[PDB]
């Protein structure tokens, strides 16, 4: 459920073309001399044949409830088929669920039938429609104004695109006066900039009801808004008290089953009425009905949520935790959860939504369960668990009491090893965390008795949930049961063979039911097809680079798919509109060169390099100008081009260096930043984004020829980039971004540790003193993401890469024996869930290609994603 992002669908993600069918339509009984047009796959528009309509005017908005939705069509279309009024309405029932549901914005809420009366015939339309319906009801629809006692709503808007015999006016602008005015969609009603109403509307606009003002609330803030309402922070006006305010507009907040927000609110009110003697449960101070929004106020608990408490108390370092004392607190919290669950299961209530956002941990380790919004009060049935957090949803129908135990089991397993995200893809995934948390806690060094007590508690929690037969089309994905220990190279060969076999299995399931791409990919780059990024050509390149390290692979269908990928990559080369190393046209040239194609790469290179270099805008490594110069310097260093083109490349590289040394602040961000996200085109700090990409180019230019201005620019860039870094309490240098610290390969600490290790012979003694500080920041024991750009593989490919030692067995052993906690299997296979596990993907940032490049770069000591020499 919970679509949008991009969508549902087992295993892979997909584009926004999957919401197909299976709901009954509305089908409003067309007469003759008319016509119905299905245009935007949401609305059917009926035009009377041979009638001129007027641009702008006053639209008519009609709302509806779910139970009596089918009667408004037969009572409004009967009105509109006599005379001549064109109207449009929704087509499928699913979009009627979604339009009045929880997900959509407050601007588009409740629009179900829209009428288009003309200017001189609106009187009879409204006078007939007021006495026509008179009994049905629905939501208010914001950004509009009500009529007297009907679901009729009015608005001044646009009717249709511009006529051929009129001035060309865009959809977003009006024609009031001689000026064009862009309209806005704000939740309150505003007359759009002085449009003169007709004489009959002045009575309906300018009137005022009774001014009896008695509001027993002082609203201070509002933490979050929704379609149902908002959750305010206020105080009572009796004497004092801090209250948490909830509201729910009538006939909205609708779910896929027929159940509104008021029923959930009343269930919350009853459930907190029953539990009215426990300090570790909220209490109700006020229940009422102001106008028709049915306000509820409940008391405000104190503490931090368990999600922040895990990150504040898990040992992420060997030195961050002192005098042990962590597992006994976990056992105490699990014992409190068991006691609470038994106590409110004895009182015949069922909380039915137990995830990390509800348990609040206050001072001295006391819990308090909040958000009793989907409570039920009967246990003899078998229902489907409908609304849940990601990773806390039950499987294949159960009793209303076992959903609480299924929640509590994974809350306890998250507190032992924080990886429960992929539990919506693999059944019984937490057994892997149960197995592999014990190895981590033994390697850190702990008393045995705490481990036995915690494992006894997890066994007791496992014993009170039923094993359910997995029939959900996701049966193939099964967790591990046996974990080995790597002691020789044959285990590494076996793991490599299993990983390529898992890639072979995950190719076919994507290619069987889709054809728009060739490999599945994370949803940030669902529409990108070029560069060292979310793509498809780097997948085959990493597959070749890993398969060359294993002797005599099965070699299924390699050459055919290589032929179509290498043909399709060059077939649409100039149809793109981006230029850059990692996301543009110059990256695929280097990858085509990396397969081979020595004539083809030079033929594309000499034809398109000048046009690619002139139209570039930015000046960073990821999508700017430095990557194209790096590719040109690589091609000059190997040598496949003419002398004058290389002279132009060197002249423009000197021009770039001279522009950089004058003012460095033009094309970067020297600061600390205030926005935190995983978006690729939003971060400006790191190796891919910022000064380290410039320093890599300066190091390559110094290694090519040897001008001292490149060394000066590199030293200036390194001294500028270390301004953004801070020092924590553990004496470690980390990148700073908002309230978060990011030691990672791409956007953080490991990029500089790789860069100053690559140039140890050129740099001097005033710059190498940060290596001990940076190595203490990339020695973590656990991180959530398994990827290459911002995951564990990026941390371990750069911690021991160059080192002037050929000892590579220890790094491979550590990487393989610690990366086992992120995987599942398929049939003698191996697939890796990517950032935000709830997926399987093959892409270079978080997936198969990232760990393939990690193993290849650990073996060959090159980091084969940035060109060098």
């Amino acid at each position: 459920m919970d679509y949008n992002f991009n969508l549902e669908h087992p295993f892979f993600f997909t584009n926004n073309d999957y919401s197909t069918d299976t709901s009954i339509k509305y089908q409003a009984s067309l007469p003759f001399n008319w016509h119905e047009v299905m245009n935007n796959d949401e609305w059917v528009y009926q035009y009377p044949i041979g009638k001129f309509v007027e641009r702008q005017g006053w639209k008519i908005h009609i709302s509806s409830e779910y139970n009596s939705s089918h009667e408004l069509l037969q009572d409004v279309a009967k009105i509109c088929h006599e005379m001549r009024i064109p109207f449009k309405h929704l087509s499928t029932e699913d979009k009627f669920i979604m339009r009045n549901g929880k997900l959509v914005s407050r601007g588009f809420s409740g629009k179900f039938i829209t009428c288009y009366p003309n200017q001189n015939e609106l009187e009879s339309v409204l006078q007939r429609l007021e006495s026509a319906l008179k009994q049905y009801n629905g939501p208010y629809i914001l950004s509009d104004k009500r009529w007297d006692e009907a679901p009729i709503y009015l608005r001044y808007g646009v009717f249709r695109p511009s006529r051929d015999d009129e001035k060309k006016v865009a959809i977003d602008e009006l024609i009031v006066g001689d000026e064009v005015v862009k309209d806005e969609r704000l939740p309150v009603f505003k007359i759009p900039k002085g449009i003169v109403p007709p004489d009959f509307l002045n009575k309906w606009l300018d009137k005022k009801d009774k001014k009896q003002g008695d509001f027993p609330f002082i609203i201070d803030n509002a933490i979050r808004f929704s379609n149902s309402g908002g959750i305010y922070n206020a105080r009572l006006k009796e004497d004092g008290k801090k209250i948490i305010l909830k509201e729910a507009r009538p006939y909205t907040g609708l779910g896929f089953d027929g159940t509104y927000s008021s029923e959930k609110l009343a269930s919350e009110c009853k459930a907190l009425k029953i539990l009215n003697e426990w300090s570790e449960a909220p209490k109700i101070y006020w229940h009422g009905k102001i106008w028709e929004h049915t306000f509820l106020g409940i008391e405000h608990m104190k503490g931090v949520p368990l999600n922040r408490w895990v990150t504040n108390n898990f040992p992420l370092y060997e030195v961050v935790d002192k005098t042990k004392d962590y597992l006994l607190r976990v056992s105490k919290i699990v014992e409190k959860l068991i006691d609470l669950t038994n106590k409110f299961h004895s009182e015949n209530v069922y909380h039915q939504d137990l995830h990390l956002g509800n348990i609040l941990v206050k001072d001295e380790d006391e819990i308090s369960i909040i958000d009793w919004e989907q409570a039920v009060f009967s246990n003899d049935e078998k229902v489907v668990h409908k609304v849940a957090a990601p990773g806390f949803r039950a499987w294949r129908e159960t009793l209303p009491s076992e959903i609480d135990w299924y929640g509590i089991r994974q809350i306890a397993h998250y507190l032992y090893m924080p990886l429960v995200t992929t539990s919506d893809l693999t059944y019984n995934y937490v057994s892997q965390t149960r197995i592999e948390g014990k190895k981590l806690f033994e390697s850190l060094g702990y008393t045995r008795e705490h481990i036995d007590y915690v494992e006894s508690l997890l066994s007791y929690l496992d014993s009170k949930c039923p094993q359910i037969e997995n029939i959900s089309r996701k049966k193939v994905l099964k967790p591990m049961h046996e974990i080995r220990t790597i002691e020789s190279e044959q285990d590494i060969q076996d793991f490599i063979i299993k990983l390529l076999r898992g890639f072979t299995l995950t190719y076919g399931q994507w290619r069987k039911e889709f054809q728009s791409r060739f490999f599945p990919v994370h949803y940030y780059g669902l529409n990108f097809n070029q560069g060292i990024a979310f793509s498809d050509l780097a997948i085959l390149w990493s597959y070749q680079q890993l398969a060359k390290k294993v002797k005599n692979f099965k070699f299924d269908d390699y050459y055919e798919i290589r032929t179509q990928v290498i043909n399709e990559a060059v077939n649409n080369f100039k149809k793109s509109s981006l230029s850059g190393l990692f996301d543009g046209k110059i990256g695929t040239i280097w990858l085509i060169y990396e397969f081979g194609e020595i004539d083809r790469a030079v033929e594309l290179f000499t034809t398109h390099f000048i046009e690619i270099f002139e139209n570039s805008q930015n000046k960073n490594l990821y999508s700017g100008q430095a990557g194209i110069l790096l590719v040109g310097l690589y091609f000059l260093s190997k040598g496949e081009i003419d002398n004058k083109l290389g002279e132009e490349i060197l002249i423009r590289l000197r021009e770039y260096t001279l522009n950089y040394i004058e003012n460095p602040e033009t094309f970067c961000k020297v600061g600390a930043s205030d926005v935190q996200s995983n978006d690729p085109y939003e971060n400006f700090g790191g190796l891919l984004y910022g000064h380290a990409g410039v320093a890599w180019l300066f190091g390559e230019a110094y290694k090519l020829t040897g001008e001292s201005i490149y060394k000066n620019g590199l030293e200036l860039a390194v001294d500028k980039e270390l301004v953004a870094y801070k020092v924590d309490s553990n004496n470690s240098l980390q990148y700073s971004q908002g309230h978060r610290l990011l030691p990672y390969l791409a956007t953080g600490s490991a990029g500089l540790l790789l860069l100053i290790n690559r140039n140890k012979e050129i740099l001097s003694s005033k710059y190498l003193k940060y290596l001990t500080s940076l190595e203490r920041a990339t020695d973590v024991v656990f991180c959530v993401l398994p990827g290459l750009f911002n995951g564990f593989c990026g941390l371990e490919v750069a911690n021991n890469i160059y080192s002037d030692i050929d000892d590579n067995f220890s790094g491979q052993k550590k990487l393989i024996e610690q990366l086992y906690r992120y995987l599942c299997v398929i049939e003698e296979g191996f697939v890796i869930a990517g950032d935000n596990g709830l997926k399987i993907t093959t892409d270079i940032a978080s997936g198969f290609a990232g760990v393939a490049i990690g193993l290849v770069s650990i073996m060959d000591n090159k980091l084969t994603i940035l060109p060098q020499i």
Partner: peptide, 24 residues
């Protein structure tokens, strides 16, 4: 409570105090 109406209607503005889409 009568003649209120406008009150709540207005209420719908205030101002929040200072990823993972798809609701919960």
């Amino acid at each position: 409570f009568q003649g209120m109406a406008e009150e709540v209607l207005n209420l719908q503005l205030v101002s929040v105090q200072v990823x993972x889409x798809x609701x919960x």
